[PDB]
Design an enzyme around this catalytic site. Structure first.
Site, PDB file in Angstrom:
ATOM      1  CG  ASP A  11     -14.075   5.427   2.392  1.00 54.81           C
ATOM      2  OD1 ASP A  11     -13.747   5.545   1.192  1.00 54.81           O
ATOM      3  OD2 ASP A  11     -13.393   5.913   3.318  1.00 54.81           O
ATOM      4  CB  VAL A 143      -8.485  -1.163   6.132  1.00 55.59           C
ATOM      5  CG1 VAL A 143      -7.438  -0.886   7.201  1.00 55.59           C
ATOM      6  CG2 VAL A 143      -7.852  -1.176   4.743  1.00 55.59           C
ATOM      7  NE  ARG A 195      -2.809   4.734  -7.636  1.00 55.50           N
ATOM      8  CZ  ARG A 195      -3.063   6.020  -7.851  1.00 55.50           C
ATOM      9  NH1 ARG A 195      -3.136   6.861  -6.825  1.00 55.50           N
ATOM     10  NH2 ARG A 195      -3.247   6.452  -9.090  1.00 55.50           N
ATOM     11  CB  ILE A 196      -7.261  -2.821  -6.165  1.00 56.14           C
ATOM     12  CG1 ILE A 196      -6.679  -2.729  -7.585  1.00 56.14           C
ATOM     13  CG2 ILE A 196      -8.662  -3.414  -6.205  1.00 56.14           C
ATOM     14  CD1 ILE A 196      -6.531  -4.107  -8.250  1.00 56.14           C
ATOM     15  CD  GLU A 197      -8.758   2.518  -1.238  1.00 60.02           C
ATOM     16  OE1 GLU A 197      -7.926   2.269  -0.339  1.00 60.02           O
ATOM     17  OE2 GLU A 197      -9.036   3.687  -1.576  1.00 60.02           O
TER      18      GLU A 197
HETATM   19  O1  LIG Z   1      -7.033   4.714   0.454  1.00 60.77           O
HETATM   20  C1  LIG Z   1      -6.346   4.590   1.649  1.00 60.77           C
HETATM   21  C2  LIG Z   1      -4.925   4.374   1.140  1.00 60.77           C
HETATM   22  O2  LIG Z   1      -4.066   3.826   2.151  1.00 60.77           O
HETATM   23  C3  LIG Z   1      -2.750   4.387   2.038  1.00 60.77           C
HETATM   24  O3  LIG Z   1      -1.770   3.346   1.908  1.00 60.77           O
HETATM   25  C4  LIG Z   1      -1.489   2.723   3.054  1.00 60.77           C
HETATM   26  C5  LIG Z   1      -0.554   1.541   2.824  1.00 60.77           C
HETATM   27  O4  LIG Z   1       0.706   2.019   2.352  1.00 60.77           O
HETATM   28  C6  LIG Z   1       1.315   1.064   1.471  1.00 60.77           C
HETATM   29  O5  LIG Z   1       2.479   0.545   2.118  1.00 60.77           O
HETATM   30  C7  LIG Z   1       3.494   1.399   2.296  1.00 60.77           C
HETATM   31  C8  LIG Z   1       4.656   0.538   2.776  1.00 60.77           C
HETATM   32  O6  LIG Z   1       4.447   0.170   4.140  1.00 60.77           O
HETATM   33  C9  LIG Z   1       5.667   0.221   4.873  1.00 60.77           C
HETATM   34  O7  LIG Z   1       6.177  -1.113   4.982  1.00 60.77           O
HETATM   35  C10 LIG Z   1       6.633   1.078   4.071  1.00 60.77           C
HETATM   36  O8  LIG Z   1       6.795   2.351   4.701  1.00 60.77           O
HETATM   37  C11 LIG Z   1       5.995   1.259   2.709  1.00 60.77           C
HETATM   38  O9  LIG Z   1       6.830   0.665   1.709  1.00 60.77           O
HETATM   39  C12 LIG Z   1       0.270  -0.029   1.255  1.00 60.77           C
HETATM   40  O10 LIG Z   1       0.166  -0.458  -0.114  1.00 60.77           O
HETATM   41  C13 LIG Z   1      -1.032   0.579   1.740  1.00 60.77           C
HETATM   42  O11 LIG Z   1      -1.944  -0.430   2.224  1.00 60.77           O
HETATM   43  C14 LIG Z   1      -2.778   5.302   0.818  1.00 60.77           C
HETATM   44  O12 LIG Z   1      -1.972   6.467   1.012  1.00 60.77           O
HETATM   45  C15 LIG Z   1      -4.248   5.654   0.669  1.00 60.77           C
HETATM   46  O13 LIG Z   1      -4.610   5.974  -0.682  1.00 60.77           O
END
Ligand SMILES: OC[C@@H]1O[C@@H](OC[C@@H]2O[C@@H](OC[C@@H]3O[C@@H](O)[C@H](O)[C@H]3O)[C@H](O)[C@H]2O)[C@H](O)[C@H]1O
Ligand SMILES: [Cl-]
Length: 443
Positions: A11, A143, A195-197
């Site tokens: 990153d 983040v 999946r956008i970051e």
């Molecule tokens: O590139 C880094 C990325 O971050 C990781 O995702 C992190 C977060 O997880 C998802 O949310 C999950 C939910 O949160 C809780 O409430 C519950 O357990 C889940 O439904 C978000 O979309 C992300 O921001 C990835 O693994 C990685 O690729």
């Protein structure tokens, strides 16, 4: 012959200061270079002996406690008008957007950075930074910041990863914190765990647009990571892609997670996984290139894309790459097919264009498939034949106007260095109005 020295900084966020380039990435990793080709690794992981932040587990204790992590995610460092360097640090638990973002300040780029405090949190059980209950389908994960000055000298920070999307805050140019009363700031795109970051904004004075770079998909080898771009007259949007789609419309379907189908139509796609390697010939190739930054050199008018990438057959191993960017006639960037080796746009002659090319088409998908080559010929009569048909022409010094299968692309012809085969190559890199990128490499 061009010399490269590799580093691993996930990153990477580029910063130039007084003739030296630095990248700061995740895990408090960093590297530096004077030429964008030979990099020196400075730091690699979060530990109490990382010189960027001595005794980091105490210095940022509150962040590690909130995020329930022992590492830090994708940093940005930006120099403010006081001459000091402001690191926007952040951590995330990793399974959820349980995260905090803060700022630390250093007198010198290589540290030490001193904590000024946390200023955003996500993943709380109750009231969020915007005064309403935290809801990851619509609120960001705090983040992956990029703090930047706009053309007028106003300070902003874009940020976000998955969760509720990508947001932008007005910042205080004296303290480095957000101006008060904004909550998470203004939404630019996203929602429903798309999946956008890794947003990054670069202004181009020549085209008079702000370019918002984004990574689509997942970072891992099977994740389909790819670099995309959108643009706006204003730093805070609205952003649009090459088709004129508003980026604000981009989101996963309600009630879903990681809905790639719904987002793939949006944005210009600059680069995804590819390989120029074939059975009888070695070639370059990347898997999941992404989480980029970008640099505009005021002195030459040249732009560069800085990113990490994985590689065919190397699993999750990653390294920093730099590719030069060129603006096409429609005001969209195209990436050089090969990493930067000191090449520049020059006059290209028709005689040096005709011949057989390996062709990569990056398309518009989010896909773990490594795009492979087909062979085409650019003929003296301006037709294209072989595995694809169309036409080609050169405009001015080096402008490439290429039609393939009835789609019109515009970009550049560029002689480059291929660092795997170790030879010079004539290339083209072009983009159509649907935001599809095509690279050609001459045989
Ligand atoms: O590139 C880094 C990325 O971050 C990781 O995702 C992190 C977060 O997880 C998802 O949310 C999950 C939910 O949160 C809780 O409430 C519950 O357990 C889940 O439904 C978000 O979309 C992300 O921001 C990835 O693994 C990685 O690729
Ligand atoms: Cl390479």
């Amino acid at each position: 012959k061009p010399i490269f020295k590799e580093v691993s900084v996930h990153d990477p966020s580029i910063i130039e200061t007084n003739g030296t380039f630095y990248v700061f990435g995740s895990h408090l990793a960093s590297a530096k270079s004077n030429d964008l080709m030979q990099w020196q690794q400075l730091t690699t992981s979060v530990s109490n002996d990382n010189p960027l932040i001595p005794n980091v587990y105490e210095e940022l204790k509150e962040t590690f406690e909130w995020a329930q992590s022992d590492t830090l995610w994708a940093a940005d460092v930006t120099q403010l008008a006081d001459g000091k360097y402001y690191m926007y640090y952040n951590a995330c638990r990793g399974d959820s957007p349980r995260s905090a973002m803060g700022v630390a300040v250093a007198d010198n780029i290589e540290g030490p950075y001193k904590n000024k405090g946390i200023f955003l949190k996500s993943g709380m059980e109750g009231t969020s930074s915007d005064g309403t209950p935290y809801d990851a389908t619509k609120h960001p994960n705090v983040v992956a910041p990029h703090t930047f000055f706009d053309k007028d000298g106003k300070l902003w920070m874009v940020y976000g990863s998955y969760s509720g999307g990508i947001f932008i805050l007005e910042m205080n140019p004296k303290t480095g914190f957000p101006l008060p009363g904004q909550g998470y700031g203004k939404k630019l795109l996203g929602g429903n765990h798309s999946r956008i970051e890794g947003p990054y904004v670069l202004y181009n004075p020549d085209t008079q647009y702000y370019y918002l770079y984004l990574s689509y998909g997942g970072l891992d080898a099977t994740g389909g990571y790819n670099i995309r771009v959108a643009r706006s007259k204003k730093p805070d949007g609205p952003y649009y892609d090459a088709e004129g789609n508003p980026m604000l419309d981009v989101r996963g379907k309600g009630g879903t997670f990681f809905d790639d189908r719904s987002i793939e139509p949006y944005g210009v796609k600059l680069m995804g996984s590819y390989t120029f390697e074939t059975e009888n010939e070695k070639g370059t190739g990347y898997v999941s290139p992404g989480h980029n930054s970008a640099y505009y050199d005021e002195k030459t008018g040249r732009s560069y894309l800085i990113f990490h990438t994985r590689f065919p057959g190397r699993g999750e191993e990653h390294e920093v790459r730099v590719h030069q960017l060129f603006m096409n006639k429609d005001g969209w960037p195209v990436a050089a097919p090969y990493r930067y080796a000191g090449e520049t746009l020059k006059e290209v002659k028709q005689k040096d264009i005709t011949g057989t090319y390996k062709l990569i088409q990056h398309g518009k998908d989010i896909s773990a498939d490594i795009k492979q080559t087909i062979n085409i010929q650019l003929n003296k009569n301006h037709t294209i034949s072989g595995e694809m048909t169309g036409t080609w022409r050169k405009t001015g010094k080096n402008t490439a106007d290429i039609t393939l299968a009835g789609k019109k692309y515009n970009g550049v012809f560029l002689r480059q260095w291929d660092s795997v085969r170790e030879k010079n190559v004539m290339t083209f890199s072009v983009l159509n109005t649907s935001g599809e990128a095509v690279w050609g490499s001459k045989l």
